[PDB]
Amino acid sequence: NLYRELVDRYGEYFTGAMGAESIQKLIENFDIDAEAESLRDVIRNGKGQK
DNA sequence: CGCCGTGTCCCTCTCCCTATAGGTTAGACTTTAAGTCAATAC
């Protein structure tokens, strides 16, 4: 209910889907390099469970 | 007020019927490759 009432009032500004095609879109829009460097930074500085 | 260890638990691995339209095959007709005989010459 919440989802349909956001999309029919705020139809622009974003794209939202459901299912495996959405996961495929996520993998499409995913920079492996910057995320990997962020993980390197986290291991370099962070500690604990993180 | 803001994050970190210990504990418990969940999970995984191992030893009905009707009506229309169209495709398929089986069955027979005429043609052809095939088996056959008779006389002959060297």
Side-chain angles (χ1 to χ4, degrees):
Chain A
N1 288 319
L2 189 140
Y3 184 90
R4 64 199 81 161
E5 61 155 312
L6 314 85
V7 294
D8 67 350
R9 285 192 288 182
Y10 302 150
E12 221 65 29
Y13 317 101
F14 83 106
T15 63
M18 186 199 305
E21 83 166 7
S22 63
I23 303 298
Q24 183 176 357
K25 299 335 179 298
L26 260 46
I27 295 171
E28 284 177 356
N29 297 115
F30 182 65
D31 186 7
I32 202 73
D33 291 332
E35 151 77 2
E37 307 169 293
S38 173
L39 272 179
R40 299 279 176 81
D41 160 74
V42 166
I43 278 147
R44 171 168 44 187
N45 314 305
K47 64 107 177 152
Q49 166 56 239
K50 325 303 190 75

